[PDB]
Design an enzyme around this catalytic site. Structure first.
Site, PDB file in Angstrom:
ATOM      1  N   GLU A 171       0.870  -1.163   0.000  1.00 43.74           N
ATOM      2  CA  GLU A 171       0.000   0.000   0.000  1.00 43.74           C
ATOM      3  C   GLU A 171       0.911   1.217   0.000  1.00 43.74           C
ATOM      4  OE1 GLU A 171      -1.644  -1.507   3.772  1.00 43.74           O
ATOM      5  OE2 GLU A 171      -3.619  -1.457   2.816  1.00 43.74           O
ATOM      6  N   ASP A 229      11.752  12.563  -0.101  1.00 39.49           N
ATOM      7  CA  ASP A 229      11.215  11.590   0.839  1.00 39.49           C
ATOM      8  C   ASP A 229      11.936  10.241   0.814  1.00 39.49           C
ATOM      9  OD1 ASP A 229       9.534  10.675   2.836  1.00 39.49           O
ATOM     10  OD2 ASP A 229       8.015   9.986   1.372  1.00 39.49           O
ATOM     11  N   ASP A 269      10.897   6.452  -6.764  1.00 37.96           N
ATOM     12  CA  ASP A 269      10.016   7.599  -6.525  1.00 37.96           C
ATOM     13  C   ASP A 269      10.671   8.979  -6.590  1.00 37.96           C
ATOM     14  OD1 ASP A 269       8.188   5.671  -4.025  1.00 37.96           O
ATOM     15  OD2 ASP A 269       8.070   5.656  -6.203  1.00 37.96           O
ATOM     16  N   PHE A 323      10.747  -3.259 -12.333  1.00 34.35           N
ATOM     17  CA  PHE A 323      10.547  -4.057 -11.122  1.00 34.35           C
ATOM     18  C   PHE A 323      11.859  -4.591 -10.538  1.00 34.35           C
ATOM     19  CE2 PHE A 323       8.405  -6.940  -8.230  1.00 34.35           C
ATOM     20  CZ  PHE A 323       9.251  -8.066  -8.167  1.00 34.35           C
TER      21      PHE A 323
HETATM   22  N1  LIG Z   1       9.497  -0.950  -8.525  1.00 29.08           N
HETATM   23  C1  LIG Z   1       9.413  -1.958  -7.608  1.00 29.08           C
HETATM   24  O1  LIG Z   1       9.797  -3.068  -7.937  1.00 29.08           O
HETATM   25  C2  LIG Z   1       8.904  -1.703  -6.332  1.00 29.08           C
HETATM   26  C3  LIG Z   1       7.948  -0.641  -6.170  1.00 29.08           C
HETATM   27  C4  LIG Z   1       7.392  -0.322  -4.880  1.00 29.08           C
HETATM   28  N2  LIG Z   1       6.538   0.633  -4.769  1.00 29.08           N
HETATM   29  O2  LIG Z   1       5.979   1.159  -5.838  1.00 29.08           O
HETATM   30  O3  LIG Z   1       6.198   1.113  -3.591  1.00 29.08           O
HETATM   31  C5  LIG Z   1       7.804  -1.081  -3.735  1.00 29.08           C
HETATM   32  N3  LIG Z   1       7.318  -0.818  -2.555  1.00 29.08           N
HETATM   33  C6  LIG Z   1       8.173  -0.808  -1.339  1.00 29.08           C
HETATM   34  C7  LIG Z   1       7.639  -1.822  -0.337  1.00 29.08           C
HETATM   35  O4  LIG Z   1       6.312  -1.494  -0.010  1.00 29.08           O
HETATM   36  C8  LIG Z   1       8.746  -2.128  -3.890  1.00 29.08           C
HETATM   37  C9  LIG Z   1       9.313  -2.466  -5.169  1.00 29.08           C
HETATM   38  N4  LIG Z   1      10.192  -3.447  -5.291  1.00 29.08           N
HETATM   39  C10 LIG Z   1      10.765  -4.257  -4.163  1.00 29.08           C
HETATM   40  C11 LIG Z   1       9.736  -5.243  -3.652  1.00 29.08           C
HETATM   41  C12 LIG Z   1       9.373  -5.297  -2.306  1.00 29.08           C
HETATM   42  N5  LIG Z   1       8.436  -6.150  -1.804  1.00 29.08           N
HETATM   43  C13 LIG Z   1       7.840  -6.985  -2.707  1.00 29.08           C
HETATM   44  N6  LIG Z   1       6.948  -7.794  -2.267  1.00 29.08           N
HETATM   45  N7  LIG Z   1       8.116  -7.022  -4.033  1.00 29.08           N
HETATM   46  C14 LIG Z   1       9.062  -6.147  -4.482  1.00 29.08           C
END
Ligand SMILES: NC(=O)c1cc([N+](=O)[O-])c(NCCO)cc1NCc1cnc(N)nc1
Length: 294
Positions: free
Chosen positions: A12, A123, A141, A78
C-alpha cells in the site's frame, strides 16, 4: 487492468496500491502503481512525464505514465526487494561494511545525477531503495513529491515516516534544496551501520528533538539563520552535541567523517552528493553481491 495481469500486491504505497504485474503483450514484469482523486492536475502530468527522461542505472526507471478514468497509473521497472526488508533480514548479523559502502556509493551516484538535473527526491527512506541479486541499489520515486504533494497519511491512513526528514523541513522552510536528500541518506547510512534507526521520531516535535539531543540544539553559530525559521521557537531546550564515536560505533573515522558532513545542520554546509563521492571513505569501495533469498 487492461494489458496487465496482476501477479501480486507489493504493498500500500504512499500514493496508492502497487502491484507486481506482467505486460500481457511484452511479457515484461513491472511494478504498477495506482495513484489516488477526482480529475488529477495536469501540472502533475507534465511534471511526472518529464521524469521518464530521468534515466540512470541507480534510479528505478519510470516506464510509463497513464492517466485515465480519474486514475493515474505509473509503470516502473521491477526489482525484487527493498532495503528496509533487507535490513530487517540482516539485523542479527548486520550488512557487511563492503556492501554498506557499495550501496552508499551507488545511492550517491544516483543523487548526484538527479541533483545535476535539478530533481529532488524529498522523501528518501529504506523502503524507497530497491535492490537486486547483482549488487545494485536504486532510488525509487524520485520527483514524485514535487509532482503530487505532502504525505502525512497514506491512502490507507498509514502514518508517514518522519525518521529521515531534514531539520530545515521540520523547522518549516518553504523551499527545499538538494541537501534534504543528503540528510536522509546520511540517516540511512547510519541505520545500515548500527542496525537501528538514527532518529526514530513519532511526531514532528519528537523527530526534531531527537535530532537536537544527538547533534546538539542548533544555534546561529552552527546554522546562521536558524533562529528566524518559521517553526523555530526560542523555548526549544538547549542540548549539548554528542560524539559520533558514540553515534555510529564501531564505524571507522573515514565513515564518521563522511556521516558528519552529511548531517551538518546548515543545508549550505552539508556535503553535496558529488563531493561525497570523492570522500576518502570510498577509497576501497567495491561491488559485492548481497545474500538474497527470493
Ligand atoms: N518498482 C518496484 O519493484 C517496487 C515498487 C514499490 N513501490 O511502488 O512502492 C515497492 N514498494 C516498497 C515496499 O512497499 C517495492 C518495489 N520493489 C521491491 C519489492 C518489495 N516487496 C515486494 N513484495 N516485491 C518487491
Amino acid at each position: 487492468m487492461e494489458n496487465f495481469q496482476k501477479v501480486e500486491k507489493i504493498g500500500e504505497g504512499t500514493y496508492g496500491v502497487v502491484y507486481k504485474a506482467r505486460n500481457k503483450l511484452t511479457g515484461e514484469v513491472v511494478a504498477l502503481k495506482k495513484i489516488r482523486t477526482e480529475g488529477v492536475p495536469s501540472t502533475a502530468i507534465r511534471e511526472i512525464s518529464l521524469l521518464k527522461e530521468l534515466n540512470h542505472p541507480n534510479i528505478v526507471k519510470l516506464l510509463d505514465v497513464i492517466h485515465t478514468e480519474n486514475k493515474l497509473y505509473l509503470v516502473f521497472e521491477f526489482l525484487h526487494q527493498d532495503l528496509k526488508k533487507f535490513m530487517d533480514a540482516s539485523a542479527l548479523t548486520g550488512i557487511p561494511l563492503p556492501l554498506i559502502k557499495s550501496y552508499l556509493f551507488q545511492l550517491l551516484q544516483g543523487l548526484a545525477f538527479c541533483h545535476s538535473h535539478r530533481v529532488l527526491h524529498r522523501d528518501l527512506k529504506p523502503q524507497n531503495l530497491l535492490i537486486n541479486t547483482e549488487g545494485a541499489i536504486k532510488l525509487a520515486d524520485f520527483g514524485l513529491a514535487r509532482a503530487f504533494g505532502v504525505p502525512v497519511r497514506t491512502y490507507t491512513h498509514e502514518v508517514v515516516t518522519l525518521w529521515y526528514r531534514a531539520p530545515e523541513i521540520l523547522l518549516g522552510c518553504k523551499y527545499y534544496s538538494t541537501a534534504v536528500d543528503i540528510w536522509s541518506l546520511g540517516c540511512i547510512f547510519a541505520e545500515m551501520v548500527t542496525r537501528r534507526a538514527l532518529f526514530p521520531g513519532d511526531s514532528e516535535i519528537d523527530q526534531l528533538f531527537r535530532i537536537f539531543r544527538t547533534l546538539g540544539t542548533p544555534d546561529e553559530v552552527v546554522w546562521p539563520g536558524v533562529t528566524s525559521m518559521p517553526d523555530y521557537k526560542p523555548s526549544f531546550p538547549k542540548w549539548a552535541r554528542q560524539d559520533f564515536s558514540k553515534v555510529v560505533p564501531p564505524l571507522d573515522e573515514d565513515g564518521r567523517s563522511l556521516l558528519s558532513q552529511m548531517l551538518h545542520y546548515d543545508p549550505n554546509k552539508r556535503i553535496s552528493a558529488k563531493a561525497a563521492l570523492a570522500h576518502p571513505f570510498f577509497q576501497d569501495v567495491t561491488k559485492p553481491v548481497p545474500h538474497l533469498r527470493l
